[PDB]
Amino acid sequence: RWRQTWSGPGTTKRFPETVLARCVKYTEIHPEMRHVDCQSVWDAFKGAFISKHPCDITEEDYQPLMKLGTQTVPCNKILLWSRIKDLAHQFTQVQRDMFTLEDTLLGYLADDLTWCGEFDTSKINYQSCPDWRKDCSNNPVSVFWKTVSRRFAEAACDVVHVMLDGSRSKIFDKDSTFGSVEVHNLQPEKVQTLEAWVIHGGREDSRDLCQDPTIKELESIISKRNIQFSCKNIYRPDKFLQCVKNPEDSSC
Ligand SMILES: Nc1ncnc2c1ncn2[C@@H]1O[C@H](COP(=O)(O)OP(=O)(O)OC[C@H]2O[C@H](O)[C@H](O)[C@@H]2O)[C@H](O)[C@H]1O
Numbered sequence: 668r669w670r671q672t673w674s675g676p677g678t679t680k681r682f683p684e685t686v687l688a689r690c691v692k693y694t695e696i697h698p699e700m701r702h703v704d705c706q707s708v709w710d711a712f713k714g715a716f717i718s719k720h721p722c723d724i725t726e727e728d729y730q731p732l733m734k735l736g737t738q739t740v741p742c743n744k745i746l747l748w749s750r751i752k753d754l755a756h757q758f759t760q761v762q763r764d765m766f767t768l769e770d771t772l773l774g775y776l777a778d779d780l781t782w783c784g785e786f787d788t789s790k791i792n793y794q795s796c797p798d799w800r801k802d803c804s805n806n807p808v809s810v811f812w813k814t815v816s817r818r819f820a821e822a823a824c825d826v827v828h829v830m831l832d833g834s835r836s837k838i839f840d841k842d843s844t845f846g847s848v849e850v851h852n853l854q855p856e857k858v859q860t861l862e863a864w865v866i867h868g869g870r871e872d873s874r875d876l877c878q879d880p881t882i883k884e885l886e887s888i889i890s891k892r893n894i895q896f897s898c899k900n901i902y903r904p905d906k907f908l909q910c911v912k913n914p915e916d917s918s919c
Pocket residue numbers: 748749750751768769808809812813816842843844845846
């Protein structure tokens with residue numbers, strides 16, 4: 668229509684088919700997640716938001732999905748990221764040791780998709796979904812990501828890495844998912860160091876972005892959780908990926 672109920676994009680075309688297909692592929696690739704029934708997962712996921720008002724979703728709504736999507740990941744190999752999506756995933760596509768949330772079953776199913784239902788009916792709304800800013804915070808997509816991102820951060824131990832976009836303006840932004848949920852769910856009992864990799868834009872010869880005021884902020888915040896802080900510039904992200912793909916050979 669010309670009006671729409673909400674300000675955000677509607678459910679992604681082919682959402683149900685896409686989620687199911689992502690689950691078959693994932694559980695096919697990963698030997699640990701081979702016990703999972705992808706139809707059961709879909710039913711659990713749909714159950715969280717179908718016939719529910721899309722401004723009144725809770726983390727409780729996603730409990731059935733979280734249960735079915737339970738996955739042990741090596742706690743010391745987690746890669747968090749903020750606003751530098753492409754390079755973070757290119758990295759874990761080549762360095763199969765480190766994992767982002769989108770490399771877990773639940774993150775993989777949901778990545779880049781939008782979904783919402785209706786309080787009015789049992790249908791999926793393909794026309795519009797609540798915008799976190801203009802409409803309401805407690806919507807199906809926002810609540811999903813808050814819940815899974817908290818649980819992922821809680822799982823981390825030892826040295827946790829985070830890729831940050833050095834071209835942003837707030838390189839560390841306290842209002843990002845990284846800054847507002849994940850930083851505040853790293854467990855002091857478990858996490859030894861948070862190490863940031865600050866990815867430079869282009870150009871070439873830049874400042875040491877590890878001295879940026881927002882990085883000092885992040886450093887002092889995580890200090891309260893009794894977590895040590897490390898920071899590295901990645902001045903040349905292209906050479907960096909090349910080095911990840913071809914380890915050894917002196918250039919790297
Ligand atoms: N739509 C989403 N909303 C909130 N968090 C998300 C979303 N998609 C992924 N995440 C989580 O955010 C992480 C990426 O961290 P930041 O870049 O720190 O997150 P941010 O930039 O705040 O993303 C919020 C999201 O809402 C807006 O619609 C925007 O388009 C972006 O997709 C994790 O990989 C994932 O845990």
